[PDB]
Amino acid sequence: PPFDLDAYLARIGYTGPRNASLDTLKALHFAHPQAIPWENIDPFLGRPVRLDLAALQDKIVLGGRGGYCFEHNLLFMHALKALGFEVGGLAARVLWGQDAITARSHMLLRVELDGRTYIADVGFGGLTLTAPLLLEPGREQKTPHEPFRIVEADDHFRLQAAIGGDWRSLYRFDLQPQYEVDYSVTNYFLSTSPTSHFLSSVIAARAAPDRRYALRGNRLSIHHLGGRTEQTEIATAADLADTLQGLLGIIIPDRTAFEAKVRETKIV
Ligand SMILES: CC(C)(COP(=O)(O)OP(=O)(O)OC[C@H]1O[C@@H](n2cnc3c(N)ncnc32)[C@H](O)[C@@H]1OP(=O)(O)O)[C@@H](O)C(=O)NCCC(=O)NCCS
Numbered sequence: 625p626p627f628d629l630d631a632y633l634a635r636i637g638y639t640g641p642r643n644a645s646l647d648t649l650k651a652l653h654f655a656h657p658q659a660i661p662w663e664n665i666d667p668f669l670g671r672p673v674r675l676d677l678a679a680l681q682d683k684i685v686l687g688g689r690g691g692y693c694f695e696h697n698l699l700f701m702h703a704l705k706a707l708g709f710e711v712g713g714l715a716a717r718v719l720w721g722q723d724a725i726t727a728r729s730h731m732l733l734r735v736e737l738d739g740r741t742y743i744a745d746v747g748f749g750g751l752t753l754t755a756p757l758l759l760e761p762g763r764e765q766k767t768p769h770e771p772f773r774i775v776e777a778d779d780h781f782r783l784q785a786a787i788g789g790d791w792r793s794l795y796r797f798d799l800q801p802q803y804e805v806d807y808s809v810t811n812y813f814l815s816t817s818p819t820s821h822f823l824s825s826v827i828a829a830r831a832a833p834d835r836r837y838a839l840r841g842n843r844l845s846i847h848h849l850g851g852r853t854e855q856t857e858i859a860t861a862a863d864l865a866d867t868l869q870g871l872l873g874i875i876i877p878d879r880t881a882f883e884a885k886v887r888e889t890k891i892v
Pocket of ligand 1: 692693694718720729730747748750751770787788827828829836840844847853
């Protein structure tokens with residue numbers, strides 16, 4: 625069974641030209657993270673996260689749900705390939721909120737356009753990129769949201785975002801290619817290891833034209849573009865599920881089990 629490009633583009637609301645241009649890459653990179661939320665509902669509920677194409681597009685595209693980094697960026701890669709882009713998988717060690725050396729727990733993409741290398745990443749979370757970036761060290765690059773830059777550190781690169789007047793590192797990466805089987809090993813760990821916090825907390829995000837929504841446990845943050853950050857404490861399991869399903873457009877397959885676990889584990 626092939627990748628259903630029509631259904632994917634309908635899922636993200638893209639009605640533009642279908643080609644392998646930079647303009648198209650920019651339009652898809654803006655739309656995807658607004659249409660499809662970042663979330664860990666399945667890992668939280670102990671449900672398997674499948675990365676194979678058939679399962680991935682059933683869940684996110686037909687089923688209208690979201691996912692976390694591997695789900696987002698594998699999906700995006702499938703779309704970019706179907707549109708004719710030259711795209712490869714990469715991996716990264718997360719620096720945001722992180723001991724000395726962290727695992728390669730994140731996925732991003734490289735896209736080759738007329739001999740130039742871009743990175744793309746629609747799956748990081750709170751600070752998911754809303755434009756592709758030129759792999760050009762040192763340079764501040766504007767996006768439809770925050771400014772980003774890539775800095776060169778020995779062998780590797782760090783992707784940084786400008787937050788509260790500081791350059792903050794999201795993650796570090798090299799150009800080693802990665803394939804689906806590599807991501808499946810890391811995904812198994814993140815989604816099922818008792819140590820992994822993707823299993824024990826509720827975490828979510830979604831981009832919007834003039835803001836980002838981000839949620840960690842019982843704290844909702846609305847980051848207005850070039851503006852204030854509104855923060856809300858969420859008092860109950862019920863209001864947590866309301867916020868996810870209403871405001872963030874996130875699907876909770878079993879709300880009772882969800883609320884039950886939230887109450888059990890003292891998240892609120
Ligand atoms: C879970 C997550 C979405 C929560 O984001 P959040 O709600 O903004 O909360 P965080 O605690 O992460 O943010 C840290 C601080 O930076 C600030 N911040 C985060 N995003 C911001 C933005 N877009 N603009 C301004 N400030 C921001 C927060 O307000 C917070 O401020 P504080 O220091 O006053 O508390 C985010 O931590 C995340 O995306 N984590 C990475 C997930 C990951 O590992 N992905 C790859 C593997 S799948």
